[PDB]
Short mmCIF file of C-alpha atoms in Angstrom, two decimals:
data_model
loop_
_atom_site.label_atom_id
_atom_site.label_comp_id
_atom_site.label_asym_id
_atom_site.label_seq_id
_atom_site.Cartn_x
_atom_site.Cartn_y
_atom_site.Cartn_z
CA UNK A 1 51.99 253.28 14.42
CA UNK A 2 49.92 253.88 11.29
CA UNK A 3 46.48 252.36 10.97
CA UNK A 4 46.62 248.61 10.29
CA UNK A 5 44.23 246.09 8.66
CA UNK A 6 41.80 243.61 10.20
CA UNK A 7 41.61 240.63 7.73
CA UNK A 8 37.87 240.16 8.39
CA UNK A 9 37.16 243.81 7.44
CA UNK A 10 38.85 243.63 4.07
CA UNK A 11 37.54 243.03 0.57
CA UNK A 12 38.95 239.70 -0.60
CA UNK A 13 39.44 239.09 -4.32
CA UNK A 14 40.24 236.01 -6.31
CA UNK A 15 41.35 235.73 -9.95
CA UNK A 16 41.89 232.46 -11.77
CA UNK A 17 44.82 233.08 -14.03
CA UNK A 18 45.00 229.44 -15.22
CA UNK A 19 42.76 226.47 -14.47
CA UNK A 20 44.91 225.35 -11.50
CA UNK A 21 46.20 228.79 -10.35
CA UNK A 22 44.00 231.28 -8.49
CA UNK A 23 45.54 234.40 -6.94
CA UNK A 24 44.06 236.04 -3.83
CA UNK A 25 44.39 239.64 -2.95
CA UNK A 26 42.87 242.26 -0.67
CA UNK A 27 41.66 245.57 -2.14
CA UNK A 28 41.12 248.99 -0.57
CA UNK A 29 40.72 252.48 -1.99
CA UNK A 30 39.85 254.26 -5.19
CA UNK A 31 42.22 255.81 -7.70
CA UNK A 32 45.25 254.58 -9.77
CA UNK A 33 45.81 250.81 -9.16
CA UNK A 34 48.84 249.92 -6.99
CA UNK A 35 49.82 246.24 -6.70
CA UNK A 36 51.83 245.31 -3.61
CA UNK A 37 54.00 242.15 -3.83
CA UNK A 38 55.41 240.65 -0.57
CA UNK A 39 58.55 238.63 0.10
CA UNK A 40 59.60 235.36 1.69
CA UNK A 41 57.98 233.97 3.81
CA UNK A 42 55.26 236.61 4.11
CA UNK A 43 51.67 237.50 3.26
CA UNK A 44 49.51 240.27 1.91
CA UNK A 45 49.34 241.14 5.60
CA UNK A 46 52.98 242.28 5.57
CA UNK A 47 51.57 245.39 3.96
CA UNK A 48 49.00 245.99 6.78
CA UNK A 49 50.46 249.43 7.61
CA UNK A 50 50.75 250.61 3.97
CA UNK A 51 47.29 249.50 2.72
CA UNK A 52 45.22 252.08 4.66
CA UNK A 53 47.75 254.88 4.18
CA UNK A 54 47.99 254.34 0.44
CA UNK A 55 44.19 254.15 0.10
CA UNK A 56 43.81 257.39 2.10
CA UNK A 57 46.41 259.02 -0.22
CA UNK A 58 44.08 258.36 -3.17
CA UNK A 59 45.18 254.95 -4.55
CA UNK A 60 43.35 251.67 -5.28
CA UNK A 61 45.54 249.15 -3.41
CA UNK A 62 45.70 245.49 -4.39
CA UNK A 63 47.82 243.57 -1.90
CA UNK A 64 48.57 240.08 -3.17
CA UNK A 65 49.05 236.75 -1.66
CA UNK A 66 51.89 235.73 -3.98
CA UNK A 67 51.76 232.33 -5.61
CA UNK A 68 52.68 229.74 -3.00
CA UNK A 69 51.14 231.72 -0.11
CA UNK A 70 47.98 232.16 1.93
CA UNK A 71 44.78 231.85 -0.06
CA UNK A 72 46.64 231.76 -3.42
CA UNK A 73 47.29 228.46 -5.15
CA UNK A 74 50.49 226.63 -4.16
CA UNK A 75 51.32 223.92 -6.77
CA UNK A 76 54.28 221.77 -5.69
CA UNK A 77 56.34 221.94 -8.90
CA UNK A 78 59.55 223.96 -8.65
CA UNK A 79 59.32 225.47 -12.15
CA UNK A 80 55.88 226.96 -11.29
CA UNK A 81 57.84 229.54 -9.26
CA UNK A 82 60.32 230.82 -11.81
CA UNK A 83 60.22 234.52 -12.57
CA UNK A 84 59.04 233.98 -16.14
CA UNK A 85 55.98 232.01 -15.02
CA UNK A 86 55.20 234.30 -12.07
CA UNK A 87 55.44 237.45 -14.19
CA UNK A 88 53.23 236.07 -16.98
CA UNK A 89 50.65 235.18 -14.32
CA UNK A 90 50.70 238.73 -12.99
CA UNK A 91 50.11 240.01 -16.55
CA UNK A 92 47.13 237.65 -16.82
CA UNK A 93 45.96 238.91 -13.44
CA UNK A 94 45.86 242.47 -14.76
CA UNK A 95 44.11 241.30 -17.93
CA UNK A 96 41.35 239.54 -16.00
CA UNK A 97 40.80 242.55 -13.75
CA UNK A 98 40.61 244.79 -16.81
CA UNK A 99 43.58 246.94 -15.76
CA UNK A 100 45.75 248.34 -18.55
CA UNK A 101 48.52 249.18 -16.09
CA UNK A 102 49.29 249.22 -12.39
CA UNK A 103 51.99 250.61 -10.20
CA UNK A 104 53.99 247.63 -8.81
CA UNK A 105 55.63 247.85 -5.41
CA UNK A 106 57.52 244.90 -4.12
CA UNK A 107 59.70 243.84 -1.23
CA UNK A 108 62.23 241.04 -1.08
CA UNK A 109 61.32 238.30 -3.64
CA UNK A 110 58.30 240.44 -4.54
CA UNK A 111 60.84 243.24 -5.32
CA UNK A 112 62.66 240.89 -7.69
CA UNK A 113 59.35 240.10 -9.39
CA UNK A 114 58.41 243.79 -9.83
CA UNK A 115 61.80 244.54 -11.41
CA UNK A 116 61.26 241.74 -13.94
CA UNK A 117 57.74 243.06 -14.56
CA UNK A 118 59.18 246.52 -15.32
CA UNK A 119 61.95 245.00 -17.45
CA UNK A 120 59.82 242.72 -19.64
CA UNK A 121 56.28 244.16 -19.33
CA UNK A 122 56.83 247.95 -19.06
CA UNK A 123 53.64 248.68 -20.98
CA UNK A 124 51.66 247.17 -18.02
CA UNK A 125 53.76 248.84 -15.27
CA UNK A 126 52.83 252.46 -14.68
CA UNK A 127 55.77 252.82 -12.28
CA UNK A 128 57.84 250.41 -10.15
CA UNK A 129 59.14 250.59 -6.58
CA UNK A 130 61.30 248.06 -4.70
CA UNK A 131 62.01 247.83 -0.94
CA UNK A 132 65.48 246.38 -0.30
CA UNK A 133 65.80 244.30 -3.44
CA UNK A 134 68.08 245.80 -6.16
CA UNK A 135 67.79 245.41 -9.87
CA UNK A 136 70.91 243.58 -11.07
CA UNK A 137 71.66 243.26 -14.82
CA UNK A 138 72.12 239.61 -15.68
CA UNK A 139 75.74 238.73 -16.43
CA UNK A 140 75.36 236.48 -19.51
CA UNK A 141 78.91 235.19 -18.92
CA UNK A 142 78.67 233.79 -15.36
CA UNK A 143 76.44 231.18 -13.69
CA UNK A 144 74.20 231.71 -10.60
CA UNK A 145 76.17 229.15 -8.54
CA UNK A 146 79.36 231.21 -8.96
CA UNK A 147 77.69 234.32 -7.44
CA UNK A 148 75.72 232.72 -4.59
CA UNK A 149 78.72 230.72 -3.37
CA UNK A 150 81.10 233.71 -3.21
CA UNK A 151 78.76 235.63 -0.87
CA UNK A 152 78.94 233.97 2.61
CA UNK A 153 75.71 235.66 3.82
CA UNK A 154 73.89 233.81 0.99
CA UNK A 155 74.73 230.30 2.41
CA UNK A 156 71.14 229.86 3.68
CA UNK A 157 70.12 229.84 -0.02
CA UNK A 158 72.05 226.59 -0.48
CA UNK A 159 70.26 225.05 2.55
CA UNK A 160 66.99 225.95 0.81
CA UNK A 161 67.75 224.14 -2.47
CA UNK A 162 67.02 220.49 -1.65
CA UNK A 163 63.22 219.99 -1.54
CA UNK A 164 61.80 218.87 1.81
CA UNK A 165 64.74 219.75 4.04
CA UNK A 166 64.11 223.39 4.89
CA UNK A 167 60.33 222.72 4.77
CA UNK A 168 60.64 220.22 7.62
CA UNK A 169 62.52 222.66 9.79
CA UNK A 170 60.33 225.66 9.07
CA UNK A 171 57.08 223.68 9.50
CA UNK A 172 58.09 221.95 12.75
CA UNK A 173 56.85 224.80 14.95
CA UNK A 174 55.26 227.63 13.00
CA UNK A 175 55.08 230.01 15.99
CA UNK A 176 58.78 229.52 16.64
CA UNK A 177 59.51 230.01 12.94
CA UNK A 178 57.78 233.39 12.67
CA UNK A 179 58.95 234.62 16.07
CA UNK A 180 62.54 233.74 15.10
CA UNK A 181 62.33 235.38 11.63
CA UNK A 182 60.35 238.55 12.31
CA UNK A 183 62.85 240.54 14.36
CA UNK A 184 64.57 243.93 14.17
CA UNK A 185 68.23 243.81 13.16
CA UNK A 186 69.48 244.23 16.71
CA UNK A 187 67.14 241.48 18.01
CA UNK A 188 68.35 238.86 15.44
CA UNK A 189 68.62 235.30 16.77
CA UNK A 190 69.79 233.90 13.35
CA UNK A 191 73.01 233.60 11.35
CA UNK A 192 72.85 233.38 7.54
CA UNK A 193 76.41 231.94 7.49
CA UNK A 194 77.29 228.25 7.62
CA UNK A 195 73.66 227.13 7.89
CA UNK A 196 74.29 223.80 6.17
CA UNK A 197 77.20 223.08 8.50
CA UNK A 198 75.21 224.11 11.58
CA UNK A 199 72.47 221.67 10.54
CA UNK A 200 69.66 224.23 10.01
CA UNK A 201 68.47 227.77 10.63
CA UNK A 202 67.21 227.21 14.18
CA UNK A 203 69.61 224.68 15.70
CA UNK A 204 71.17 227.31 17.98
CA UNK A 205 68.32 229.78 18.35
CA UNK A 206 65.88 229.84 21.32
CA UNK A 207 63.22 227.13 21.49
CA UNK A 208 60.78 229.73 22.88
CA UNK A 209 61.93 233.00 21.31
CA UNK A 210 60.73 236.23 22.73
CA UNK A 211 58.43 238.47 20.73
CA UNK A 212 60.15 241.20 18.69
CA UNK A 213 59.24 244.79 19.49
CA UNK A 214 58.02 244.91 15.87
CA UNK A 215 55.14 242.38 16.14
CA UNK A 216 52.35 241.29 18.52
CA UNK A 217 51.43 237.71 19.36
CA UNK A 218 48.18 238.20 17.45
CA UNK A 219 50.13 239.24 14.35
CA UNK A 220 52.42 236.21 14.65
CA UNK A 221 49.38 233.95 14.95
CA UNK A 222 47.92 235.36 11.70
CA UNK A 223 51.05 234.17 9.84
CA UNK A 224 50.85 230.84 11.66
CA UNK A 225 47.27 230.31 10.52
CA UNK A 226 48.12 231.30 6.93
CA UNK A 227 51.04 228.82 6.65
CA UNK A 228 48.89 225.91 7.87
CA UNK A 229 47.18 225.98 4.44
CA UNK A 230 50.09 224.97 2.18
CA UNK A 231 53.26 225.10 4.34
CA UNK A 232 56.67 226.13 2.99
CA UNK A 233 57.17 224.23 -0.29
CA UNK A 234 55.67 226.85 -2.58
CA UNK A 235 57.43 229.70 -0.77
CA UNK A 236 60.81 227.89 -0.84
CA UNK A 237 60.39 227.06 -4.52
CA UNK A 238 60.96 230.78 -5.21
CA UNK A 239 64.64 230.03 -4.39
CA UNK A 240 64.88 226.95 -6.58
CA UNK A 241 64.91 228.53 -10.03
CA UNK A 242 68.26 230.41 -10.06
CA UNK A 243 69.46 229.05 -13.42
CA UNK A 244 66.10 229.48 -15.12
CA UNK A 245 65.74 233.05 -13.79
CA UNK A 246 69.22 233.93 -14.96
CA UNK A 247 68.61 232.55 -18.44
CA UNK A 248 65.35 234.56 -18.70
CA UNK A 249 67.04 237.73 -17.48
CA UNK A 250 69.76 237.28 -20.13
CA UNK A 251 67.08 237.63 -22.84
CA UNK A 252 66.73 241.27 -21.87
CA UNK A 253 69.75 242.00 -24.13
CA UNK A 254 70.85 244.99 -22.04
CA UNK A 255 67.59 246.91 -22.42
CA UNK A 256 67.02 249.60 -19.81
CA UNK A 257 63.97 250.20 -17.65
CA UNK A 258 62.57 253.46 -18.91
CA UNK A 259 59.47 253.86 -16.66
CA UNK A 260 59.43 255.78 -13.35
CA UNK A 261 61.27 253.77 -10.71
CA UNK A 262 62.05 253.97 -6.97
CA UNK A 263 64.68 252.02 -5.04
CA UNK A 264 64.42 252.12 -1.26
CA UNK A 265 67.37 250.77 0.77
CA UNK A 266 67.34 249.58 4.40
CA UNK A 267 70.46 250.42 6.44
CA UNK A 268 70.32 247.28 8.58
CA UNK A 269 69.29 244.67 6.02
CA UNK A 270 72.37 242.44 6.14
CA UNK A 271 71.25 240.18 3.25
CA UNK A 272 69.93 242.84 0.87
CA UNK A 273 72.50 245.47 1.69
CA UNK A 274 72.19 249.08 0.37
CA UNK A 275 75.46 248.75 -1.57
CA UNK A 276 73.95 246.02 -3.77
CA UNK A 277 71.87 248.85 -5.41
CA UNK A 278 74.99 250.86 -6.33
CA UNK A 279 74.98 251.08 -10.02
CA UNK A 280 71.27 251.02 -10.75
CA UNK A 281 71.04 254.45 -12.39
CA UNK A 282 73.12 253.09 -15.32
CA UNK A 283 70.19 250.79 -16.32
CA UNK A 284 67.28 252.91 -15.04
CA UNK A 285 67.41 256.55 -16.25
CA UNK A 286 64.35 257.72 -14.21
CA UNK A 287 65.39 256.14 -10.95
CA UNK A 288 64.62 257.90 -7.67
CA UNK A 289 65.75 256.71 -4.25
CA UNK A 290 64.84 256.43 -0.64
CA UNK A 291 66.79 255.20 2.34
CA UNK A 292 65.60 254.19 5.77
CA UNK A 293 67.96 254.32 8.74
CA UNK A 294 67.70 251.85 11.59
CA UNK A 295 65.71 249.54 9.34
CA UNK A 296 66.30 245.84 8.98
CA UNK A 297 65.01 243.28 6.44
CA UNK A 298 61.30 243.48 7.43
CA UNK A 299 61.00 247.00 6.17
CA UNK A 300 57.22 247.48 6.20
CA UNK A 301 56.82 246.49 9.86
CA UNK A 302 60.16 247.87 11.14
CA UNK A 303 59.63 251.40 9.83
CA UNK A 304 56.04 251.67 8.56
CA UNK A 305 55.74 255.46 8.97
CA UNK A 306 58.93 256.01 6.96
CA UNK A 307 57.85 253.56 4.24
CA UNK A 308 54.47 255.24 3.95
CA UNK A 309 56.02 258.70 3.67
CA UNK A 310 58.54 257.68 1.01
CA UNK A 311 56.05 255.75 -1.10
CA UNK A 312 53.32 258.42 -0.99
CA UNK A 313 55.74 261.22 -1.91
CA UNK A 314 57.04 259.22 -4.86
CA UNK A 315 53.57 258.01 -5.96
CA UNK A 316 52.21 261.54 -6.01
CA UNK A 317 55.15 263.00 -7.92
CA UNK A 318 56.02 260.18 -10.36
CA UNK A 319 53.37 257.42 -10.51
CA UNK A 320 50.01 259.15 -10.66
#
């Protein structure tokens, strides 16, 4: 395994982007700024294997707690977690740190955010990389509840819409939650289909799940401790802005992303499947790609060595 991070041994930074919103991050390294943006329901600590490697490769790494998570503010309002608001905050974040640009690397919902950052704020994005999450041009002629519904593997997203319901289930036993979620593809104890009908994500999964090969008990307990601060409302609110996000994306008016870009697909991610990235070159002329075999949804901890190799090669050739 690559070198990891001990939370206590990190530099912790805090930036107040608005009077009620302060964003936490950890920072390591000197060199061009790279801003890592995690997914749901994760942490800056999801990047524990990349942070040292990227620093050693000659980059100044800023690994965020995204809004809703960890030491970052977690307001309860749904519309505080739309893409427009989150992206404008990240611009303010750069402004307050005095950074003209950064490289933005995201995974999962953080991948969605970095695409929107490249789309609408290219002047502040030196280059953009996404793990798993594609860029998808908004279809200004079809609604988000026509797309979600069609895709049966997206049914969990409907279970996550009504505030309080998924929170109760995910907060009931935090250890069980993380142990159930953070698994390799072949170790999966969860179905993303028919969640509403089943009555929840964990109604059929083990009460005392085993530990994935990917994670230690200590690592699980870090996530547990982090989610005691604010729970799952903020994190889940990222899912609760589909219409608003679509309307914002429609304002792009078909503009391309013209900065350096990298799309990395994961063979065994069954939600964010490689094929969903199919026509990205048509919108992104300077797109490069990576692909990781035997790699599920939790890319950074499933295949950290591979991630580190792909990102450093691309950073050195295209971002620096």
